[PDB]
Amino acid sequence: RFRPPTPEPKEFLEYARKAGLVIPQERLERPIH
Amino acid sequence: RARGNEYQPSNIKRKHKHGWVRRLSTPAGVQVILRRMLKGRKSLSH
Amino acid sequence: LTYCSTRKGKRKTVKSVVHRFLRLHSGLWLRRKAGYKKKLWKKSTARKKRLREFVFCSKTQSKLLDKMTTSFWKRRNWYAGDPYQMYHDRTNLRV
Amino acid sequence: GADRMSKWTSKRGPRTFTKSRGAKKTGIYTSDRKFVQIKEMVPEFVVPDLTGFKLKPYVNYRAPAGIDTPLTAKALFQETVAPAIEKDFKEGTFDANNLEKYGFEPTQEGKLFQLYPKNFPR
Amino acid sequence: KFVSWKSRTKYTVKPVKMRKSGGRDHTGRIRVHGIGGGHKQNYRMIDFLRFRPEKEKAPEPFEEKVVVVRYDPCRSADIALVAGGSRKRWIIATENMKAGDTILNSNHIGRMAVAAQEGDAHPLGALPVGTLINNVESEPGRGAQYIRAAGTCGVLLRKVNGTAIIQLPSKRQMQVLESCTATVGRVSNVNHNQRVIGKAGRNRWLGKRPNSGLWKIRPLPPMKSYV
RNA sequence: UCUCCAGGCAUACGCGUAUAACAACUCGGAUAACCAUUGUUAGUUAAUCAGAAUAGGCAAUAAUCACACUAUAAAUUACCUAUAACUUCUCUGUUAACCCAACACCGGAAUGCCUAAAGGAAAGAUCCAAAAAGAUAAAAGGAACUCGGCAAACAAGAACCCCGCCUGUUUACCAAAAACAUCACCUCUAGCAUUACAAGUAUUAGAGGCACUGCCUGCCCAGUGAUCACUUGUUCCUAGGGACUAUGACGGCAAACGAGGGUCCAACUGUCUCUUAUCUUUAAUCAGUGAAAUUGACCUUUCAGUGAAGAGGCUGAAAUAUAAUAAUAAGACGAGAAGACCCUAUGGAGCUUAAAUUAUAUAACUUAUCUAUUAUAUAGUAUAAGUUUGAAAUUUCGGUUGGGGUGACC
RNA sequence: AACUAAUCCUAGCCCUAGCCCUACACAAAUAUAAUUAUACUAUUAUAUAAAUCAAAACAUUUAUCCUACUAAAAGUAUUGGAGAAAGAAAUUCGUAAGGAGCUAUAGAACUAGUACCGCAAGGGAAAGAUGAAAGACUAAUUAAAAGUAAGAACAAGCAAAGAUUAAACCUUGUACCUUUUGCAUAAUGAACUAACUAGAAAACUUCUAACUAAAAGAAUUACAGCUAGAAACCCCGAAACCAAACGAGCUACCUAAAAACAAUUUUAUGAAUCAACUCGUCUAUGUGGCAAAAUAGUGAGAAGAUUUUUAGGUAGAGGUGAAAAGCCU
Ligand SMILES: [Mg+2]
Ligand SMILES: [Mg+2]
Ligand SMILES: [Mg+2]
Ligand SMILES: [Mg+2]
Ligand SMILES: [Mg+2]
Ligand SMILES: [Mg+2]
Ligand SMILES: [Mg+2]
Ligand SMILES: [Mg+2]
Ligand SMILES: [Mg+2]
Ligand SMILES: [Mg+2]
Ligand SMILES: [Mg+2]
Ligand SMILES: [Mg+2]
Ligand SMILES: [Mg+2]
Ligand SMILES: [Mg+2]
Ligand SMILES: [Mg+2]
Ligand SMILES: [Mg+2]
Ligand SMILES: [Mg+2]
Ligand SMILES: [Mg+2]
Ligand SMILES: [Mg+2]
Ligand SMILES: [Mg+2]
Ligand SMILES: [Mg+2]
Ligand SMILES: [Mg+2]
Ligand SMILES: [Mg+2]
Ligand SMILES: [Mg+2]
Ligand SMILES: [Mg+2]
Ligand SMILES: [Mg+2]
Ligand SMILES: [Mg+2]
Ligand SMILES: [Mg+2]
Ligand SMILES: [Mg+2]
Ligand SMILES: [Mg+2]
Ligand SMILES: [Mg+2]
Ligand SMILES: [Mg+2]
Ligand SMILES: [Mg+2]
Ligand SMILES: [Mg+2]
Ligand SMILES: [Mg+2]
Ligand SMILES: [Mg+2]
Ligand SMILES: [Mg+2]
Ligand SMILES: [Mg+2]
Ligand SMILES: [Mg+2]
Ligand SMILES: [Mg+2]
Ligand SMILES: [Mg+2]
Ligand SMILES: [Mg+2]
Ligand SMILES: [Mg+2]
Ligand SMILES: [Mg+2]
Ligand SMILES: [Mg+2]
Ligand SMILES: [Mg+2]
Ligand SMILES: [Mg+2]
Ligand SMILES: [Mg+2]
Ligand SMILES: [Mg+2]
Ligand SMILES: [Mg+2]
């Protein structure tokens, strides 16, 4: 027997940079002060 | 001879041997389904 | 022996003791002699007399029989005209 | 080693196995394997003339929304049937037998669009 | 799932396709060992009730013409196509039957003996004692069941009152009413017993699987020290 | 572009996006390059390829170039009669280096066409040690090798014994055989139909044995007169009187064939005397990746002694800078496997019976019960009670005796 | 002066109490090879539970299993290879939300009947951890396990002890547990770390109290007794047996429908030579291998009792068997 290969997923940016991603801009609900 | 390849796939044979219609044909087969439904199996039959 | 019964949770008497021995309230047990009704024609007259008697049991035999019977068989029974009325107690016993 | 969990479709199995993807039939298969499409069995899209139509996909944000009052049989009955029966009752020209006069239908049979069992699609 | 192939209600002379059993029954289990495979065969519906009058015709002696005497895969004897009126029916052929022959089928119970010509069907009462017969029926109207193999002929030993005694090929004497219809003569292929199989493959052509390789008086008490 | 290798392309079955592009460089490919991996986006287009009205009547004449030709195993909806309807194209399969073997497994995998026009790469770099694996050559000799000509050979010819008739079949994964089957032969059982035997009928069917052919001889075949009478034999009635009695179960042998088991000769050879050289694999060194059994702890020496056949470790002598690399296999009673051997259990199980106990398995009878009849009587029988038969079922395998016959003994 | 690691608290769960239920939720699809809009082929549980086991075997028998109110009558009457054991009734009595439970190897198997394994019935996991705020950049805390690194070793030996100015030299010392026998230089088991992992009951005896010819909150015992408290008897491991399902996609045999066999010589063939194809004789390699039976050579059959393909059948008290007690994933 064996154990399964879970991929086991400052880190999100690398994750999406390697994979590539469509990051649509978001309208900030609260205006910045 | 080399063993381990006793499985020769065939969709006709599979659905005839272990399919929904086959299981419901006899009361014992219906109880096979009843056990699996009670256990919560995602697959009741092939 | 049944130590804890399924229905009542108690010990059970071994009804083979109840049908063979008499217990005196003091603690003694009486029995017969094995073979006292067997082949009497070839037994000597003295031998037959020994066989007919009621006899006591040893300390270890009495200890065993006490284990095999329940308390109900150890109570004091007030029978009118009992022929063992006088044998239920010990007298002049220093030991 | 067969896959028990994925859906059974016509792509799987031998050539003899075939089954539909949910498209409604439009014809009949006669003997000697001739397909005969029936014109009535093929749906017809009834599209209206939209020339001069004032309504567009979206609405003014300045338009006040209304309080929700989902339609009920009583509200439908009062709006449509009550005015006639009430006036007729005062006139005295009313009887139980003539409920068809006000729009009642004793049976749905013979109508093109039957309300039960429904015989038309959306 | 075993459905018998013998499902045809109506008589025809067209050969009918047979499904083989293998020695197994409708349960699916072997009930007789040694049957399997062999050549594919067609069944020609034989008619063993010799005196069958044609439909919508009177019940009296009639005649038929022999079209051909043919080989039959399904029996030891050989079969003859016979035509009369508007009807063709397969029948078992006697030893000397040839094409173009004419054979009588008689209902009349001859009060006296009738001269016997091989191939004609006569009630046992009509025939004289001693005549070789074949295709005998147990009871009038039943149909022929005995003496139907190749070259097998029985004798008509005796006739008294309304019944007669028949010596079956096994030498077992049987008794039947003199009204029963028996064909005259031997049954043909008399040399069938002389045939030689020769090679093991030939039996596997006839659907005969090989034999398996697996290789009682209780004494009475007074006679057990001598066993 | 060069060098070299030689099952490829389709379909079926199966698989289920591995297809293609881009971007990534963590995981996956047993390493890199690159991607078969990750994410995102795309894709396979069919009226021809492929898939998915009713009721009657009736059929003798194979295939093989189907002519000739014989044969034996005997062998593929049509055409008619009436009724009914009186212009139709939707739906689904379509990708790939693919599937079954835990894997990108030297295995398994049907058919058509074709045999290189299609499809591919045995070497990561280096080095040429031992041992190991494979290929080629061999002075002189030619089986002297060896359990045996095993393996190999510039050989592949000839014969003879034993067994089995022969082609066949088997212990998937240690036995391919002399075992099994086999035509031929033989014995036993069955006189019959609508689900096997069989849509058959004793020249048939089933069960089983066995080499065939020819050649041999045992049994058995009332006795004497002679188709005839007595004596026998068998029955009765009482030792008498009647009654009645007109051919084999065994051996001995036949060529052909055999991956059977023995044997010989010829030829041939590195089997051997007696080994050698070359090339490839492996090895070794460099780079990348990276297991397995095993392991009380070890700072892990030699000799004599002691010890249970036994000592790196105990007694007494002796030896002794420390760590690697590559080799050998004496030892660590070296490591592994479900290996062997005897004995034990009031542990199992398979098999056989002549073990014990049962046995509405089948079969039979008998008495009732219930019907028919009949002069009491013979028939049958949705059941009960017996008896007989025994397909089966359940349970067991006392003790002491270098170990096994019998005996015995308790 | 640190790597591998470690710390953690709530996700849920457990046993009771209480309570009949009326959760059975859009459209569409589905019993056809389920989830495929319409005809074809129509549809339907089960005769008595058995065995293990106890009787130290086993053969009648063996609590619960196979339920009918509590406490008492009572382990009494009875029943039983009168053995092991089994066991009543008449009769009397009876008006009611919580935790000296678990807290991620625990508690449910559960983050899930999923992944994954299996043809099928069926079997069946593992794991998470910042803060008030991540629209504060996802934290900290710890000589702390085995394992390593920092920092290879330096005559001599169960690795230590006595010591010593001195780490080693000198001296003393036959690893451990079980087991043999109360002995081993036998022999079994142990690579190491963390967690988990095995004595349970009140008949009699003893001890401490209450009341005492009586004791006990009904039913019991009593010629100093009676009542209450305290005090007790393990864990893991077969080959087996029985009931009900599931299996013939491998293999054995069969049914139906289909396929393949060149060239050469004989003849007119279970004939010959020899491919494809089927098989597996002999030797070597391999032996956790490419392979849970292969590779490379060498071989046997190769128009037939041949081989192959597809779908169907026979099922364990059984099936199949050219009998090898072979085959039935
Ligand atoms: Mg498998
Ligand atoms: Mg297959
Ligand atoms: Mg035999
Ligand atoms: Mg690609
Ligand atoms: Mg790329
Ligand atoms: Mg990709
Ligand atoms: Mg087509
Ligand atoms: Mg394609
Ligand atoms: Mg590999
Ligand atoms: Mg090319
Ligand atoms: Mg290469
Ligand atoms: Mg190289
Ligand atoms: Mg050479
Ligand atoms: Mg030489
Ligand atoms: Mg020698
Ligand atoms: Mg020799
Ligand atoms: Mg050789
Ligand atoms: Mg042979
Ligand atoms: Mg052979
Ligand atoms: Mg073998
Ligand atoms: Mg085989
Ligand atoms: Mg062989
Ligand atoms: Mg072999
Ligand atoms: Mg034999
Ligand atoms: Mg051989
Ligand atoms: Mg020579
Ligand atoms: Mg390296
Ligand atoms: Mg040293
Ligand atoms: Mg020594
Ligand atoms: Mg020493
Ligand atoms: Mg090295
Ligand atoms: Mg060594
Ligand atoms: Mg003993
Ligand atoms: Mg036993
Ligand atoms: Mg027992
Ligand atoms: Mg029993
Ligand atoms: Mg848990
Ligand atoms: Mg768990
Ligand atoms: Mg540490
Ligand atoms: Mg020292
Ligand atoms: Mg030992
Ligand atoms: Mg037992
Ligand atoms: Mg099959
Ligand atoms: Mg050919
Ligand atoms: Mg041949
Ligand atoms: Mg050959
Ligand atoms: Mg040959
Ligand atoms: Mg076979
Ligand atoms: Mg045998
Ligand atoms: Mg198996």
PDB file of N, CA and C (backbone and C1' of nucleotides) and ligand atoms in Angstrom, chain F residues 299-301 322-323, chain G residues 155-157, ligand 28:
ATOM      1  P     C F 299      31.543   0.990  16.595  1.00  0.00           P
ATOM      2  O5'   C F 299      33.050   0.814  17.065  1.00  0.00           O
ATOM      3  C5'   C F 299      33.546   1.490  18.213  1.00  0.00           C
ATOM      4  C4'   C F 299      34.976   1.108  18.485  1.00  0.00           C
ATOM      5  C3'   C F 299      35.198  -0.367  18.796  1.00  0.00           C
ATOM      6  O3'   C F 299      36.470  -0.774  18.299  1.00  0.00           O
ATOM      7  C1'   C F 299      35.919   0.927  20.623  1.00  0.00           C
ATOM      8  P     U F 300      36.615  -1.342  16.807  1.00  0.00           P
ATOM      9  O5'   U F 300      35.791  -2.701  16.840  1.00  0.00           O
ATOM     10  C5'   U F 300      35.996  -3.645  17.881  1.00  0.00           C
ATOM     11  C4'   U F 300      35.673  -5.047  17.437  1.00  0.00           C
ATOM     12  C3'   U F 300      36.375  -5.495  16.155  1.00  0.00           C
ATOM     13  O3'   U F 300      36.838  -6.841  16.274  1.00  0.00           O
ATOM     14  C1'   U F 300      34.036  -5.739  15.918  1.00  0.00           C
ATOM     15  P     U F 301      38.416  -7.123  16.347  1.00  0.00           P
ATOM     16  O5'   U F 301      38.538  -8.699  16.535  1.00  0.00           O
ATOM     17  C5'   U F 301      38.773  -9.557  15.430  1.00  0.00           C
ATOM     18  C4'   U F 301      40.245  -9.721  15.139  1.00  0.00           C
ATOM     19  C3'   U F 301      40.850 -11.069  15.486  1.00  0.00           C
ATOM     20  O3'   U F 301      40.576 -12.062  14.515  1.00  0.00           O
ATOM     21  C1'   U F 301      42.270  -9.347  16.261  1.00  0.00           C
ATOM     22  P     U F 322      45.964   1.039  14.005  1.00  0.00           P
ATOM     23  O5'   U F 322      45.251   2.383  13.545  1.00  0.00           O
ATOM     24  C5'   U F 322      44.743   3.302  14.499  1.00  0.00           C
ATOM     25  C4'   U F 322      44.223   4.547  13.833  1.00  0.00           C
ATOM     26  C3'   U F 322      43.171   4.327  12.760  1.00  0.00           C
ATOM     27  O3'   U F 322      41.874   4.202  13.316  1.00  0.00           O
ATOM     28  C1'   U F 322      44.837   5.803  11.950  1.00  0.00           C
ATOM     29  P     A F 323      40.749   3.304  12.610  1.00  0.00           P
ATOM     30  O5'   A F 323      39.994   4.332  11.660  1.00  0.00           O
ATOM     31  C5'   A F 323      39.559   3.945  10.371  1.00  0.00           C
ATOM     32  C4'   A F 323      39.564   5.103   9.411  1.00  0.00           C
ATOM     33  C3'   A F 323      39.183   4.752   7.979  1.00  0.00           C
ATOM     34  O3'   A F 323      37.783   4.776   7.765  1.00  0.00           O
ATOM     35  C1'   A F 323      41.227   5.917   7.968  1.00  0.00           C
TER      36        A F 323
ATOM     37  P     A G 155      45.341   4.862  19.963  1.00  0.00           P
ATOM     38  O5'   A G 155      45.257   3.356  19.463  1.00  0.00           O
ATOM     39  C5'   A G 155      46.107   2.876  18.430  1.00  0.00           C
ATOM     40  C4'   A G 155      46.355   1.396  18.563  1.00  0.00           C
ATOM     41  C3'   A G 155      45.522   0.675  19.629  1.00  0.00           C
ATOM     42  O3'   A G 155      45.140  -0.617  19.164  1.00  0.00           O
ATOM     43  C1'   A G 155      47.809   0.301  20.026  1.00  0.00           C
ATOM     44  P     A G 156      43.591  -1.028  19.066  1.00  0.00           P
ATOM     45  O5'   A G 156      43.158  -1.262  20.578  1.00  0.00           O
ATOM     46  C5'   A G 156      42.253  -2.302  20.935  1.00  0.00           C
ATOM     47  C4'   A G 156      42.005  -2.330  22.423  1.00  0.00           C
ATOM     48  C3'   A G 156      42.206  -0.996  23.133  1.00  0.00           C
ATOM     49  O3'   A G 156      41.368  -0.936  24.285  1.00  0.00           O
ATOM     50  C1'   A G 156      43.742  -2.550  23.982  1.00  0.00           C
ATOM     51  P     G G 157      40.062  -0.010  24.297  1.00  0.00           P
ATOM     52  O5'   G G 157      38.890  -1.007  23.891  1.00  0.00           O
ATOM     53  C5'   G G 157      38.484  -2.036  24.778  1.00  0.00           C
ATOM     54  C4'   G G 157      37.803  -3.175  24.062  1.00  0.00           C
ATOM     55  C3'   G G 157      37.290  -4.289  24.968  1.00  0.00           C
ATOM     56  O3'   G G 157      35.954  -4.057  25.375  1.00  0.00           O
ATOM     57  C1'   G G 157      38.690  -5.212  23.303  1.00  0.00           C
TER      58        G G 157
HETATM   59 MG    MG H  28      39.914  -2.525  16.339  1.00  0.00          MG
END
